[PDB]
Amino acid sequence: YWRFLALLGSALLVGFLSVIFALVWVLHYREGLGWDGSALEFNWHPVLMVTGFVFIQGIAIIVYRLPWTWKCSKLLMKSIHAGLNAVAAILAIISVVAVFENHNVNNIANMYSLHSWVGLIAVICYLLQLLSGFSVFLLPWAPLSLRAFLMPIHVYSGIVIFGTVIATALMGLTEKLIFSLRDPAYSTFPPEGVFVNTLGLLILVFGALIFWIVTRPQWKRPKEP
Template sequence: MESGGGAASTPRTLPYYVAFSQLLGLTVVAMTGAWLGLYRGGIAWESALQFNVHPLCMVIGLVFLQGDALLVYRVFRNEAKRTTKVLHGVLHVFALIIALVGLVAVFDYHKKNGYADLYSLHSWCGILVFVLYFVQWIVGFSFFLFPGASFSLRSRYRPQHVFFGATIFLLSVGTALLGLKEALLFKLGKSGLSQNQTHPLWCLDITPTP
């Protein structure tokens, strides 16, 4: 959970890039919420709408918050290393918890309704990404926050941590897009899918509210 240290000059254009990334991230979260609310019936835990908790949590946790965690060392490069390290870790903690809620929601929904788990490419990619993210989180905590790893060991592992962090983030974005595409395919093929009862929630013919 650590990147390179030491004070460095901040590029003049960095604040604009950061502001754009935050605007883009918040727009994605807002659009996901609006899509679920207007076209998927909304969000509720104890109902058929429990499944909708899944995409919203995954977008917030593994896309928006994980992306912000990766930006910490760029945005606060002149702050104390311990401060940026803690902020980086806290954002990842929230991302992990929210993503875990999203996973629990989809598995619990399947269990309540008797549907099969892990039946699509998106679901397998999602489990892979979450496992990789969890392993990255545990290893990062052990190396950079737990007071046991030596400085030389941290220095050797840091490049791998940065590389896998960026890779897992890109995989998270790709998996989210794959899930949205899967939802579209379910919607387009709602007749056949309703008969097979693969995932009837996506087949609900819900029109947007005025």
């Protein structure tokens, strides 16, 4: 228990510092936020991706392992899981609408990067996991046999989508640092560069923590009757 608490506490801390770091970066180092800057719009992209796709999704993935929930309703904890993942799907979609509207308004090319390829698949895989998870594991009519062998795919896919989001995030930080830190150049170790590398590491440590919590068999929600 109290090593779980300490680990949950650590992941919340690093997860909140990531969101904090993403906000300071766009509000104090970049131009800020707005729904047409248009770089004030683009900046919603990293902010909302860190906040929903990395942080809120990180918490949805461990929601069933909070021991205060074990003798809670399984339908209820399915609802918090479903709902916390839906919030991150909304924010991530909004996040992608930000780049497309900044790009199209500014006549920039779309979908040429490995970041955007990996990312757009992450997003599509995410919605499919959300739609499939809703009709099979929340919704009532599905055959309990189809439950039995979709479940290993669903647990694996969620960890693998969550890992791929983190790898897309560090790619997006990389692109945006390189595009932006032209003078002083990124390679000159400017403060924005040290700061956002540290945001990169924080997003890293958060994933490692979420992956630790979620693979402790002693912390699985105890199977139902």
